[PDB]
Symmetry: C2
Subunit: 198 residues, 2 copies
């Protein structure tokens, strides 16, 4: 789980184009939010790219936390690959970490839907830290086994240590160290991996 | 001129894919020589990629110092663009900085061929520091005006300060700070820019 400069170092003596893909992803994130810091804050695990491509080529399920993340996904490219897209809740108005944490407090069985995610799924969490925390716990206990976790919720003061907990996970992941998150960032990240595949 | 990490910083809030192109070029260099240091040593100037693409799209002439550089160029792609390829000398056996400096000492009129390079041409120097130095001098005096200079000669003890002199040039350029050079590196660099255009 390392930064741009370090990743790039070890990916350049590779036959694959993982270095080009990594910088494409950073570029797309910066074009979404306008913040060059993400070169530092963004963290990919070794084998994140490879696990992503392998899962996408096999037409993996894709699960997002909330609808706005799903709706920003490149839906037609994903359909061509045979990937289906689902959300953990259906609330149409979620724009902040507070609206998200509130909404995941009302629904009584989103944890059920998370627990049922198919092995090999891509899990993209753009809004709610508590959902990312629950995902990390289920992974540790070996109840779920996604191919990839994209964890880019917003970080708030006294948040569930979620992004930091994801960095210790044995599951391939991409995250944003610190309090940056939300917007469409999680969807942009996944889109960058989709568009460099087809 | 500036390194990888710095270039990348200022190229990410750009609409164009110059950040992806830069990392592709680094990647190709590392696949040619196997040396990850070039991330540090390689230096691009601010307008380098853009000037390259503009000149290649216009079917610019390409001039190399020696045949082995020309022969490593992607000849068919360049022909499709309308770019011609020429060399400053025709010696078929040049493998080291010594064989190159020797050969540019015998020929009496390579400086004439250099002085004649058309405005807007791409100049790729892979072997001889003294040729790069002469090129820098002609540029300062405004006798020649290439669109781009790729300067990747070998750096030897008490060499003509050439690579360092190229970094002060007003002409867009790509070079390798320090004593690394030769092989096919100059040709690989140019090829990376050609293949990401067509």
């Amino acid at each position: 789980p390392e930064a741009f400069q370090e990743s790039l170092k070890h990916l350049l003596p590779d036959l694959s184009d993982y270095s080009e893909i990594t910088i494409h992803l950073l570029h797309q994130l910066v074009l979404a939010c306008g913040d060059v810091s993400l070169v530092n804050a963004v963290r990919l695990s070794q084998g994140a790219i490879a696990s992503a491509r392998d899962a996408l080529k096999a037409g993996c399920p894709v699960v997002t936390d909330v609808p706005v993340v799903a709706a920003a996904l490149d839906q037609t490219r994903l359909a061509h690959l045979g990937c289906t897209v689902k959300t953990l809740i259906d609330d149409p108005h979620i724009t902040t970490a507070r609206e998200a944490e509130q909404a995941f407090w009302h629904h009584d069985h989103w944890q059920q839907r998370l627990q049922q995610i198919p092995q090999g799924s891509v899990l993209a969490i753009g809004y709610a830290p508590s959902v990312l925390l629950t995902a990390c716990k289920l992974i540790e206990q070996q109840h779920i086994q996604p191919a990839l976790v994209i964890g880019m919720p917003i970080g708030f003061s006294h948040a569930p240590a979620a992004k930091r907990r994801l960095m210790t996970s044995p599951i391939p992941h991409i995250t944003i160290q610190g309090s940056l998150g939300g917007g469409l960032l999680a969807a942009v990240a996944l889109n960058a991996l989709v568009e460099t595949l087809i």
